[PDB]
Every structure is written in C-alpha cells, then in structure tokens.
Amino acid sequence: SVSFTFPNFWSDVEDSIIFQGDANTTAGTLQLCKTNQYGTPLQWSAGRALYSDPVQLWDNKTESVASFYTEFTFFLKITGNGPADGLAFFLAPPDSDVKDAGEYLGLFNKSTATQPSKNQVVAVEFDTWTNPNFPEPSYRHIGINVNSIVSVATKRWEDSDIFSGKIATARISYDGSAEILTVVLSYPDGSDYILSHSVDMRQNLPESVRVGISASTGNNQFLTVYILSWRFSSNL
Amino acid sequence: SVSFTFPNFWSDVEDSIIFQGDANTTAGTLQLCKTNQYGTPLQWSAGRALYSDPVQLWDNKTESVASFYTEFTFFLKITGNGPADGLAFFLAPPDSDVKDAGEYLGLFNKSTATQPSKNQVVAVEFDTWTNPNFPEPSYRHIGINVNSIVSVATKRWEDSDIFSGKIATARISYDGSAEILTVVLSYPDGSDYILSHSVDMRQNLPESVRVGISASTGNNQFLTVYILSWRFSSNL
Numbered sequence: 520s521v522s523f524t525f526p527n528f529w530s531d532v533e534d535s536i537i538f539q540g541d542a543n544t545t546a547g548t549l550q551l552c553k554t555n556q557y558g559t560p561l562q563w564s565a566g567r568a569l570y571s572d573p574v575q576l577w578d579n580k581t582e583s584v585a586s587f588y589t590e591f592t593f594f595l596k597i598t599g600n601g602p603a604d605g606l607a608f609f610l611a612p613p614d615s616d617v618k619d620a621g622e623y624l625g626l627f628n629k630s631t632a633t634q635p636s637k638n639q640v641v642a643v644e645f646d647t648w649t650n651p652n653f654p655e656p657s658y659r660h661i662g663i664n665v666n667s668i669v670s671v672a673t674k675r676w677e678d679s680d681i682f683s684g685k686i687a688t689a690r691i692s693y694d695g696s697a698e699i700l701t702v703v704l705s706y707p708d709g710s711d712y713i714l715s716h717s718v719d720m721r722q723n724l725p726e727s728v729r730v731g732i733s734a735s736t737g738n739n740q741f742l743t744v745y746i747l748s749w750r751f752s753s754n755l
Numbered sequence: 756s757v758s759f760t761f762p763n764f765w766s767d768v769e770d771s772i773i774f775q776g777d778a779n780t781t782a783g784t785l786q787l788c789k790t791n792q793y794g795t796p797l798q799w800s801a802g803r804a805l806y807s808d809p810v811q812l813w814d815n816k817t818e819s820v821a822s823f824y825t826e827f828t829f830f831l832k833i834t835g836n837g838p839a840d841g842l843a844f845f846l847a848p849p850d851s852d853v854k855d856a857g858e859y860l861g862l863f864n865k866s867t868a869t870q871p872s873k874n875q876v877v878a879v880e881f882d883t884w885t886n887p888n889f890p891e892p893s894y895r896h897i898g899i900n901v902n903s904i905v906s907v908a909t910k911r912w913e914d915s916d917i918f919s920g921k922i923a924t925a926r927i928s929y930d931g932s933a934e935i936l937t938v939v940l941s942y943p944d945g946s947d948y949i950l951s952h953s954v955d956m957r958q959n960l961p962e963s964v965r966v967g968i969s970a971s972t973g974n975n976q977f978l979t980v981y982i983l984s985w986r987f988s989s990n991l
C-alpha cells in the first residue's frame with residue numbers, strides 16, 4: 520500500500536527519505552558515499568537511502584505476499600579501472616541500519632554474511648568488484664540476494680556498459696503470487712539485462728519493511744554512484 | 756540481437772513496421788482497429804503491427820533461449836461500458852498473419868484456440884472482455900498465453916484503471932535462462948500489476964520470430980486502443 524516518485528532529488532527529500540551512513544543528496548542526485556572537495560571518492564565508505572514509510576510485505580492473518588515494482592536510474596562515475604563496489608536495492612526491517620562497507624554494500628556484516636538466519640535483508644545487487652577470495656561468480660555482475668552475500672541468481676554485467684558513461688535504468692518487480700523477483704537493467708545503448716528468480720518474502724523478512732538503496736566503496740577510489748531518480752509501488 | 760525504439764509514430768514507420776488487418780498509424784499513434792469518420796470503432800475488427808526484423812529466440816546448435824525486454828504505452832479510449840477486446844504483445848513466426856477478431860485478439864482462430872499443437876504464438880494479453888461462455892477467468896484481466904486462448908497465468912485488471920482515461924505503461928521481460936516471462940502494467944496513478952510465469956520459448960515457437968502488438972473488437976463499439984510508443988531489446 521505504498522508508492523512514491525522521485526523524478527530527481529532537488530526537493531526537500533528528508534521528509535520521505537532516511538539517510539544512513541554517508542548517504543546524502545548532491546545536485547538533484549542521491550549520492551550514497553562521500554567524496555573529497557577534489558571530488559575523489561573516500562575509502563571504505565557505506566551509505567543507504569531508505570524510504571521513511573514502512574511497506575506491508577505480507578500479512579500473517581489475511582495471508583498473501585505483496586507485489587511491487589520499483590524503478591531507478593543511476594550513473595557510475597568511474598575514473599580508474601578498479602570500480603568497486605556498486606549499489607543495491609533492498610528491503611529490510613524498519614529499524615535496519617547501515618552495515619559494513621566493501622563488498623557488503625552496507626547490507627551485511629563481515630562475519631555473518633553467509634549465515635541466512637542472522638540476516639534480515641533481500642536485495643538486488645549491482646556489483647563491479649572482482650574479488651576472487653569472495654564467494655563468487657567472481658566477475659562484475661548483477662545478482663539477487665536473500666539474507667546472504669552468496670546470490671541465488673546471478674547475471675554477468677559486461678564492462679562496456681559498466682564503463683559506458685551512460686545513465687542506466689534499473690527495474691525490479693516482484694509478483695507476490697508466483698513469488699518471482701525480476702530485475703531488468705537498461706542502457707540507452709539498447710543493451711539490457713533480464714534476471715528472474717524465486718524469492719520467499721514471507722520466510723526471509725518481517726511483515727513490515729523499509730525499501731532502500733545502498734552503495735559502498737572499498738580500497739580503490741575509482742567509483743562514485745549516483746541515483747538520479749527512484750519510483751516505487753507496492754500492493755498487498 | 757534485435758532492438759528498436761518508437762518514441763511515437765510520426766516517422767515514416769513502414770520501413771520497420773508491418774501492418775496487418777486494420778492496423779495503421781494515427782496521429783503519432785499506432786491504431787490497431789479502424790473507426791468511422793465520426794470516430795466510432797468498427798465491429799469485429801482485428802489489427803496487428805509487427806516489427807519487420809525477425810528475432811532469434813533460440814538457437815538449435817549453440818543452444819540457449821534469448822532474453823528480451825519490451826515496453827510500450829497505450830490508451831484505452833472507452834465510451835460505453837462494454838470495452839472489448841483489448842490488445843496483446845506477442846511473438847509468432849516471421850510469416851504469421853492476422854487471425855480472428857473478438858476475444859481472439861487477431862492471434863487465434865475460432866476453432867483451434869485451445870489446441871496448442873495447432874498454434875504458433877506466445878503472448879501477453881490485456882483483456883477487457885467479460886464473456887462467461889469463453890474459457891475463464893471470466894473478468895477483465897491481464898494474462899500470459901502460450902499457444903492457447905486459455906492463459907497459464909492471469910491477474911485481474913481493475914476497472915478503475917481500465918476506464919482511468921490515463922496512459923498505461925506495459926513492461927514485458929523474458930529471462931531466457933530462468934525461462935520466466937514477467938509483465939508489469941503501470942498507471943501514473945501509481946497502481947501497478949506484476950505477473951510472472953514460466954514459459955518455454957524453445958518448445959512453443961520456432962527459432963525466428965516477429966514481435967508485435969494486436970487488438971480486436973467484437974460486437975460493442977465502445978473501445979479504441981492506441982499504442983503511443985514501443986521499445987524493444989533482445990539478446991541471445
């Protein structure tokens with residue numbers, strides 16, 4: 520029963536948005552991590568923007584899982600060749616706070632990343648990191664995660680797009696009936712990515728959630744992520 | 756390996772588009788069925804617009820099913836209260852021609868509508884008809900069809916939106932890996948519809964297809980459907 524539209528971020532914004540970590544607005548943009556005055560991205564930073572109004576994912580009683588659609592556009596301002604880590608759209612309990620930086624995208628802690636029982640987060644990640652010592656695919660990719668840093672579904676994200684210097688459009692939908700989460704990543708280039716997989720929102724998250732977007736940086740300082748717009752709609 | 760963008764239909768259009776049945780352009784719009792000079796919709800009409808370039812759905816040899824995304828906006832110009840039948844996005848062999856009008860949306864013939872073996876068409880229908888003598892749901896709805904007029908997945912389409920008098924956005928994606936077809940129907944009102952289900956493009960259609968949109972009318976003359984824009988992207 521929640522829907523919102525942010526054509527950009529020049530409005531006040533802090534009514535409807537909750538900023539965690541480095542998260543802040545920057546020129547009608549949503550900037551998740553912080554940068555120098557010389558515009559260089561700070562190391563090991565995490566940031567998340569959450570919509571201030573909770574969403575009914577499921578209802579114990581009247582029993583069924585909500586369906587929702589979300590859309591947002593972003594830009595990967597990349598300088599060097601070690602872009603990391605990226606961003607993610609996610610759902611979490613209303614009181615969730617930012618987590619670890621690095622490949623955790625401020626969604627997971629270093630120690631319990633793989634233990635589903637100790638987590639409250641379902642997300643769609645857009646990863647540009649390439650750390651082999653981390654649970655794979657091991658290459659830059661788009662993935663769906665359910666209370667774990669090891670994705671149930673992954674789709675490779677070609678560098679030609681990642682470093683395109685173009686605005687990408689992310690479309691995430693969830694059919695709370697067929698319980699299928701779909702992710703479509705579009706580039707004006709025409710190139711698109713479609714990723715779909717089963718997710719049980721009832722078994723992994725509480726009845727009420729907060730929807731948000733987060734980013735994090737690691738060692739390198741070659742990446743800055745900007746969210747230019749974000750729309751959302753849910754129905755239970 | 757095919758992608759196109761029609762922000763509207765004021766360009767020449769007939770290079771890239773193939774008009775079948777009543778299909779024709781009308782004021783930067785795609786008008787599938789014909790109307791009076793008094794603008795009244797003609798009875799029992801069918802029309803389909805097909806993209807002139809074939810799409811590789813699957814490849815026998817190098818074996819895998821393509822993934823694709825499609826988007827289009829439309830308007831339901833409804834006068835009376837018997838809007839019928841609606842429109843559909845679909846895939847068919849390159850040489851497919853328009854079929855029966857009525858609840859067949861120019862995609863099926865009256866006699867073999869339910870016999871999957873005698874059909875070559877996978878589609879997403881947006882039905883406004885309410886004929887109880889027809890294979891149900893029996894109420895106005897959005898549905899996914901695979902070589903049959905009886906949908907594998909259906910989602911109810913509330914009248915408040917159907918008769919909204921607003922522009923609707925249809926988003927259809929297919930993950931040729933997880934083999935999941937998703938449909939998101941959006942209204943500026945915020946109201947959205949998410950429908951996902953399994954579809955085997957390899958078993959129901961030939962290697963090469965034509966993507967298109969079609970509409971049809973029955974007895975009533977209370978409906979005219981317009982497609983304002985249509986973008987598409989496929990990758991095998």
Ligand SMILES: *[C@@H]1O[C@H](CO)[C@@H](O)[C@H](O)[C@H]1NC(C)=O
Nearest residue numbers: 533538540541542543544545
């Ligand atoms: C956002 O950044 C500005 C500087 O551009 C600062 O003045 C403000 O306090 C910050 N607000 C939040 C919520 O981080």
Ligand SMILES: *[C@@H]1O[C@H](CO)[C@@H](O)[C@H](O)[C@H]1NC(C)=O
Nearest residue numbers: 617618619620627628629630
């Ligand atoms: C998780 O990481 C955050 C941020 O570093 C920290 O404040 C919190 O205490 C950590 N929680 C656990 C269980 O490690």
Ligand SMILES: *[C@@H]1O[C@H](CO)[C@@H](O)[C@H](O)[C@H]1NC(C)=O
Nearest residue numbers: 769774776777778779780781
């Ligand atoms: C389309 O309709 C116009 C009238 O508006 C007509 O002149 C033209 O021949 C038609 N073309 C096709 C392909 O139907």
Ligand SMILES: *[C@@H]1O[C@H](CO)[C@@H](O)[C@H](O)[C@H]1NC(C)=O
Nearest residue numbers: 853854855856863864865866
């Ligand atoms: C299907 O319907 C079309 C349009 O009415 C017709 O031309 C065609 O011959 C029909 N085919 C069959 C097998 O009935």
